[PDB]
Amino acid sequence: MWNSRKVGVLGGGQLGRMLVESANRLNIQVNVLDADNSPAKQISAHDGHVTGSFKEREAVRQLAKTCDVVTAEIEHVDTYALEEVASEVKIEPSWQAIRTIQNKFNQKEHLRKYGIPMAEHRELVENTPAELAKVGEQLGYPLMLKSKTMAYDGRGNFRVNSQDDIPEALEALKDRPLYAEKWAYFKMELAVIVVKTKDEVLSYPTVETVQEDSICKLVYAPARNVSDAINQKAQELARKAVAAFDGKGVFGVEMFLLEDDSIMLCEIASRIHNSGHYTIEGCALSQFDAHLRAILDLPIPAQSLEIRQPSIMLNIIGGAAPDTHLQAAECALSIPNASIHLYSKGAAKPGRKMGHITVTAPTMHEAETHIQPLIDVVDRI
Amino acid sequence: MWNSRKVGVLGGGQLGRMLVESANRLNIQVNVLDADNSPAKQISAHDGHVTGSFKEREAVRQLAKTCDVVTAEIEHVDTYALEEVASEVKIEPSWQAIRTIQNKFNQKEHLRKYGIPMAEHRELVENTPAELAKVGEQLGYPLMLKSKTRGNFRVNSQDDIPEALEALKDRPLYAEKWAYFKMELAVIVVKTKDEVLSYPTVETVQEDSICKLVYAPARNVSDAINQKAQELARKAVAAFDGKGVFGVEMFLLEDDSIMLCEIASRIHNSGHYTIEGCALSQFDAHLRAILDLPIPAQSLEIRQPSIMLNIIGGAAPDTHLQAAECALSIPNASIHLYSKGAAKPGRKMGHITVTAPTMHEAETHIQPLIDVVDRI
Ligand SMILES: Nc1ncnc2c1ncn2[C@@H]1O[C@H](COP(=O)(O)OP(=O)(O)O)[C@@H](O)[C@H]1O
Ligand SMILES: Nc1ncnc2c1ncn2[C@@H]1O[C@H](COP(=O)(O)OP(=O)(O)O)[C@@H](O)[C@H]1O
Ligand SMILES: Nc1cncn1[C@@H]1O[C@H](COP(=O)(O)O)[C@@H](O)[C@H]1O
Ligand SMILES: Nc1cncn1[C@@H]1O[C@H](COP(=O)(O)O)[C@@H](O)[C@H]1O
Ligand SMILES: [Mg+2]
Ligand SMILES: [Mg+2]
Ligand code: NA
């Protein structure tokens, strides 16, 4: 009815899985495109999934020929197959938004036309040290070396501190299209989850995030020690970046806070984002519930995106050992107020996002205290 | 690891479903024994499930054979069948405790040995008019005609006896002395290998004999009554062997004293609010309890006032859809549909839990949904 439609999700990792939990609560059929038995398929026992990859032309097209709206839980999808099937199903958010967004360098130039403040950069026309060395004397060291495509979870980033790191950097991001970014000296990082609807623009509070080795680690929601003046500029900034893109759906906005208190965009995501996991226990409508509603033109009471109590989300990243992530979840079993989410991801690879723990509390202070020991254990591994 | 043990659950209705939701978060495998595509199995795509009824000796024996522990999501389960296998698989909570509980008369007699304040009652051996009549004289009217095993009949005076008896024909009974409560109460208790914990006392509301609404916590009920209820609950449940979540329904008497209504040996309707209401739901709590995992006390506390509205089948096989479609627009409304599909009259189709910082506030948001459901 309002829930008879089928939703095609390109990608079926943890994100796709949180989306399915939300789908399941409303009895909306979610057909997933990804490997068999992926995280999302694991909790949706029916026959509509499609086996194959989201960057796969014919797999992308089959999914679409069987669903009323096709969405994505990842950006590195075949937007060409999507333009091809644009006539057979609705796509939200838009294939052009995804195509743009999926190339970081391209995303950025798209936004610069829009006024968006963002770190200086230089594309790398070949992958020579000569080239890099050059760009180095153009924007200084260190600098962030980055792959234009396929990057997520710090996977296409490489900090270059000196000209002596050059070969390692290049090796590291071997055979990928690159660009370098002038350093961003942030006093903190922020993120706003924006929701684009048929007739409205909604958003959650600004949160403070902490990244290490280029990967998100913690999220404090709402953001600590930030004036309502900053929260605000942050929010405007985020809505602006989003308005630059076509589509209904949840959008993730990453910004850096300058020592000067001014704001910079770090990157924009045309999907459900790690920065918003706290919404599950943190608000009445999680980002995941929100996103389905948006792409299905279902209501979204704004009150439901307000934060119920303070919270902190800690990621459970693969460590040196492959058992290691379990030890963290295990410790979480004893943190008061800690909600544990394991991704059913398989082999835990170092740096691999394997699950998250979200801790709430009537006050940050107290949420901070409940979680310390778990960060402590997490830290020593 | 700590989450490599297998859980087999008898039943795959909305209860097993939420129980499955919780294990999927922990990636703990659940083999459900029930029909195919049961609400629960649909959210658990693996091959360990068993197709059958939890009333058939063999379906059951098959499930134990593939689990570490066996638990249940419905009370009417075969406990002799379960008994048989307590040799091959651990059963939590006890088949004995289950067996005792699923008979309300026996459940009742075990609990008097323990001091559980309850209604006086009288066992009907004959299901004869003359026998009932006598009882009535000791107990007074009206009184509650009850089956030990929809199964109740309020009897007002001598004359209703007749109607009252066919009314509960086939079944054996005992009648209960009237309870003049001013409110109904419920406590979700958690029996751990080591302790008996409870979540807060909540107020429950019925309609046509089916839970309709629950107010968490119970409205304008002093802190003392709350704790008294919690105490009584914990104490009755401690009279049982085995681990796991137990739901205890109580009567608040006019004099503010508490009387036990009944105990259910499992995750129970009155506790659904614990999903959005507490850091650890009753589903989360059960899985931990049975598997011996920590259960931090604070995680059992109510984060904010919440109200759960059950979504009950009406006359139309779609109506639940109205309720939920109306709820899409209710502020702070967390919707739970059971994928039971086919709406029949009075069937439990889903539930909605609405939260807010204050109970008054939640009542305000949910009102219209109530009217809605009421309109139909
Ligand atoms: N210019 C930069 N200067 C300093 N640190 C950066 C810069 N760009 C990225 N980072 C750091 O790495 C994190 C992840 O980088 P990002 O560009 O967001 O890639 P990913 O797609 O893999 O998220 C950022 O949150 C920030 O900590
Ligand atoms: N002794 C009693 N006097 C008044 N009402 C009673 C009595 N016993 C049961 N009831 C009412 O009947 C409803 C169902 O009774 P209960 O013993 O819980 O039966 P069931 O297991 O069938 O729900 C109760 O929740 C309460 O309203
Ligand atoms: N982190 C991220 C960025 N873009 C998508 N994801 C999530 O990460 C997945 C899987 O990452 P992994 O490479 O560890 O399997 C995606 O499908 C989605 O759920
Ligand atoms: N109503 C109830 C009573 N005891 C448990 N349940 C739940 O009801 C389900 C089945 O309800 P139905 O008869 O409508 O199919 C059971 O599996 C369990 O979840
Ligand atoms: Mg990022
Ligand atoms: Mg009852
Ligand atoms: Na950092």
Which CATH number belongs to the domain containing residue A94 in this structure?
3.40.50.20
Decide: B10 and B70 in contact? Cβ < 8 Å: yes
Looking at the structure, do residues A80 and A200 belong to the same domain, yes or no?
Answer: no
CA distance B334 to B330: 9
Question: B336 near B351, Cβ under 8 Å?
Answer: yes
- SS3 for A216? strand
* Cα–Cα dist A14/A107, whole Å: 24
Torsion of CA B272, B277, B279, B281, to 10 degrees: 0
Q: Which two tokens stand for residue A282?
A: 């943190």
CATH of the domain at A156: 3.30.1490.20
Q: Does A25 touch chain B (CB under 8 A)?
A: yes
In this structure, what token pair is assigned to residue B270? 């009155």
Bridge partners, A314 (sequence order)? A218, A357
In this structure, the dihedral spanned by the alpha carbons of residues B81, B84, B90 and B92, taken in order and rounded to 10 degrees, is 40
What is the rounded CA–CA span in Å between residue A248 and residue A294? 6
End-to-end Cα distance, chain A: 49
SS3 state at B299:
helix
Nearest CA-CA partner of B285 in B293, A342, B233, B339: B293
Phi and psi based region of residue A370 (left: phi greater than 0; alpha: psi -120 to 50; beta: remaining): alpha
Q: Best substitution site from B145, B150, B152, B206 to test ligand 2's pocket, by max atoms within 8 Å of Cβ?
A: B152
Residue type, A132: L
Chain A neighbors of B1, CB-CB under 8 A: 323, 326, 330
Cβ of B302 under 8 Å from any chain A Cβ?
A: no
- Pairing assessment for the beta strands B173-177 and B143-147 based on DSSP bridges: antiparallel
Q: Which of these, B28, B103, B29, B33, lies nearest to B73 by C-alpha position?
A: B33
- Dihedrals φ, ψ of A71, to 5°? -130, 180
- Domain closes at, from B89, B112, B135: B112
**Amino acid found at A315:** N
A75 touches A53 (CB < 8 A) = no
Distance in Å from the first CA to the final CA of chain B: 50
Ligand 3: centre distance to CA B192 (Å):
37
Nearest CA-CA partner of A183 in A150, A141, A212: A141
Same domain as B320, residue B238 = yes
8 Å CB contact of B279 and A342: no
Alpha carbon of residue B195 to chain centroid: 21
Cα Rg for chain A, rounded, in angstroms?
A: 20
- The contacts of residue A54 (CB under 8 Å, 6+ apart) are A10, A11, A33, A34, A60, A72, A74, A76, A77, A78
Q: Name all contacts of A149-152 with Cβ < 8 Å and 24+ positions apart.
A: A149/A76, A149/A102, A149/A103, A149/A104, A149/A176, A149/A177, A150/A76, A150/A176, A151/A104, A152/A74, A152/A75, A152/A76
| Count of other CB atoms within 10 angstroms of residue A317 | 25
Pairing of strands A249-258, A263-269: antiparallel
- The residues, ordered by sequence, that sit 6+ positions from A320 with a Cβ below 8 Å of its Cβ are A350, A381
Parallel/antiparallel/unpaired status of strands B244-253 and B258-264: antiparallel
Distance separating alpha carbons of residues A23 and B339, to the nearest angstrom: 11
Q: Which residues of chain B lie closer than 8 angstroms to A2, CB-CB?
A: 321, 325, 328
Domain of A4? 1-112
Number of domains in chain B: 3
- Residue A119 has a CB neighbour count (10 Å cut-off) of 17
Q: Are residues A274 and A247 in the same domain?
A: yes
A50-51/A69-72 β-pairing: unpaired
Residue B141 Cβ < 6 Å to ligand 2:
no
**Residues A39 and A174 grouped into a single domain:** no
Rounded Cα gap, residues A248 and A67, in angstroms: 17
B67 is in an annotated binding site: no
**Do residues A108 and A158 share a domain?**
no
CA distance A158 to A143: 8
Q: Tell me if A186 CB under 6 Å of ligand 3.
A: no
- Which residues 6+ apart lie within 8 Å of A381 measured at CB? A319, A320, A324, A327, A328
Chain B CB contacts of A336 below 8 Å? 279, 296-299
List residues bridging with B333 in a β-sheet: B354
The Cα B112–Cα A340 span in angstroms is 40
Pairing state of beta strands B143-147 and B152-155?
antiparallel
Strands, E assignment, B210-329: 210-216, 244-253, 258-264, 306-312
The CATH number assigned to the domain holding A219 equals 3.30.470.20
| Helix segments in A160-286, DSSP class H | 166-172, 228-243, 279-282
If asked whether residues A271 and A237 sit together in one domain, one would say yes
Assess whether the C-beta atom of B176 lies below 6 angstroms from ligand 2: yes
Among residues B23, B26, B14, the alpha carbon closest in space to that of B73 is found at B14
What is the DSSP secondary-structure string of B120-177? -EEE-SS--HHHHHHHHHHH-SSEEEEE----EEEE-SGGGHHHHHHTT-SS-EEEEE
B360 touches chain A (CB under 8 A): no
- In eight-state DSSP terms, residue B350 is E
Buried b (16+ CB within 10 A) or exposed e, B187-226: bbbbbbeeebbbbbbbbbeeeeeebbbbbbbbeebeeebb
Cα angle: A321, vertex A323, A327; to 5 degrees? 115
Using CA atoms, how far apart are residues A69 and A90, in angstroms rounded to an integer?
5
- B80 — contact with chain A (CB < 8 Å)? no
- For B368, phi then psi, to 5°, come to -55, -30
Residue B188 and residue B326 in one domain:
yes
- Strand A143-147 to A311-317 pairing: unpaired
- Residue whose C-alpha is closest to residue B244's, from B181, B188, B206, B177: B188
- Which domain-ending residue is among B177, B205, B227? B177
Domain stop point among A148, A182, A216: A182
Distances in Å between the alpha carbon of B136 and those of B139, B151, B308? 5, 18, 37
Task: Work out whether strand A69-72 and strand A90-91 pair parallel, antiparallel, or are unpaired.
Answer: parallel
Residue A182, annotated as binding a ligand? yes
Do A248 and A163 lie in one domain? The reply is no
Query: DSSP assignment, residue B372?
Result: H
Provide the 10 A C-beta neighbour count for residue B120: 13
Identity (one letter) of the amino acid at B51?
T
β-pairing verdict for A207-212 and A338-342: unpaired
Q: Give DSSP secondary structure letters for A18-79.
A: HHHHHHHHTT-EEEEEESTT-TTGGG--SS--EES-TT-HHHHHHHHTT-SEEEESSS-S-H
Cis peptide before B200 (omega within 30 of 0): no
The structure was resolved to a resolution in Å of 2.0
> Are A150 and A9 in the same domain?
no
Distance CA B246, CA B248 (A): 7
Which chain A residues are closer than 8 Å to B288 by Cβ?
A: 333
Cα distances from A321 to residues A326, A349, A351, B251, B286, in angstroms, run: 10, 8, 11, 54, 30
Phi, psi (rounded to 5 degrees) for A42: -50, -25
B264 closest CA partner among B278, B281, B282: B282
Chain A residue with Cα closest to B24: A43
Nearest CA in chain A to B288: A333
Element of type H or E holding B118: none
User: Residue A300: CB partners within 8 Å, gap ≥ 6?
Assistant: A195, A197, A200, A202, A285, A290, A293, A294
What H or E segment, with its residue span, contains residue B370? helix B359-375
Taking the C-alpha atoms of residue B278 and residue B298, their distance in angstroms, rounded to an integer, is 9
State how far the Cα of B170 lies from the Cα of A363, in Å rounded to an integer.
57
Among residues B306, B278, B303, B302, which one has the least CA distance to residue B365? B306
Do residues A41 and A23 make contact, with C-beta atoms less than 8 angstroms apart? no
**DSSP SS3 for A117:** coil
* Best CA proximity match to B373, nearest among B331, B303, B314: B314
- In this structure, the answer to whether residues A23 and A155 fall within a common structural domain is no
Q: How far apart are CA B14 and CA A48, in angstroms?
A: 23
Same domain as A158, residue A11: no
Determine, for residues B294 and A338 on separate chains, whether the beta-carbon distance falls below 8 Å: no
Q: CB-hemisphere CA count at 13 Å for A33?
A: 29
CA diameter of chain B: 64
Q: What are phi and psi of B28, to 5 degrees?
A: -105, 130
Q: Which residue of B has its CA nearest to A289?
A: B334
Give helix then strand counts, H and E, for chain A.
12, 18
B54 & B136 share domain: no
**Among partner residues A21, A299, A360, which is closest to B303 by beta-carbon distance?**
A360
